[PDB]
């Protein structure tokens, strides 16, 4: 009886129930609250050596493994969720996307424009919500739905 995409789960380390969204890879403790023509998102991309284009403004030759990229993503998610860092700050500094220079903002978009896992996560996010790691041919994304 959750907004589709959501399932109940159990913390392995604490035993407390939590909720996990298999479209956004978001996870949270509270029972989730519960589509538009367009959404607006920012993202932080970490590329890896199997990215469609393993290069970025940060690195001419991206050589980190997918596993290493996921660990970087996971670390950014932790710092964002703790408030130690802001999403926009980490995107500006560390996103392997040209959108880093705009704090990760991609602007508004419809279905059919973005890579499908990105599109599905973006449209499943609530306004203001952040994704977990989202995988595309570009790399691994943290997605923030801003509108
Ligand atoms: O090894 C790691 C790297 C990432 C993707 C490749 C695959 O093999 C799985 C999938 C989700 C993680 C894990």
Sign (positive or negative) of CA dihedral 71, 82, 119, 24 = positive
Per-domain boundaries in the chain: 1-32, 38-147
Q: Which atom of ligand 1 is nearest to the CA of 65?
A: 3
- Centre of ligand 1 to C-alpha 66, Å, is 7
- Centre of ligand 1 to C-alpha 79, Å, is 22
Taking domain 1-32, whether its CATH number is 1.20.120.1150 is answered by: no
CATH class of the domain at 38-147? alpha beta
Question: What stretches of 38-147 adopt beta strand conformation (E)?
Answer: 39-46, 105-109, 134-136, 139-145
- Do 118 and 141 touch, CB atoms closer than 8 A? yes
Q: Which atom of ligand 1 is nearest to the CA of 133?
A: 11
Resolution in A: 1.6
- Centre of ligand 1 to C-alpha 101, Å, is 28
- Do 19 and 8 touch, CB atoms closer than 8 A? yes
């Amino acid at each position: 009886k959750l907004p589709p995409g959501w399932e109940k789960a159990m913390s392995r380390s604490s035993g407390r129930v939590y909720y996990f969204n298999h479209i956004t890879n978001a996870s949270q403790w509270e029972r989730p609250s519960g589509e538009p023509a367009r959404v607006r998102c920012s993202h932080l991309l970490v590329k890896h050596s199997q990215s469609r284009r393993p290069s970025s403004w940060r690195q001419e030759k991206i050589t980190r493994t997918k596993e290493e990229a996921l660990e970087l993503i996971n670390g950014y998610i932790q710092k964002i969720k703790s408030g130690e860092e802001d999403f926009e700050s980490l995107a500006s500094q560390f996103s392997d996307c040209s959108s880093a220079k705009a704090r990760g903002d991609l602007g508004a978009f419809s279905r059919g424009q973005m890579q499908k896992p990105f599109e599905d996560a973006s449209f499943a996010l609530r306004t203001g919500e952040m994704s977990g790691p989202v995988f595309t041919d570009s790399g691994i994304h943290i997605i923030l739905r801003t509108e």
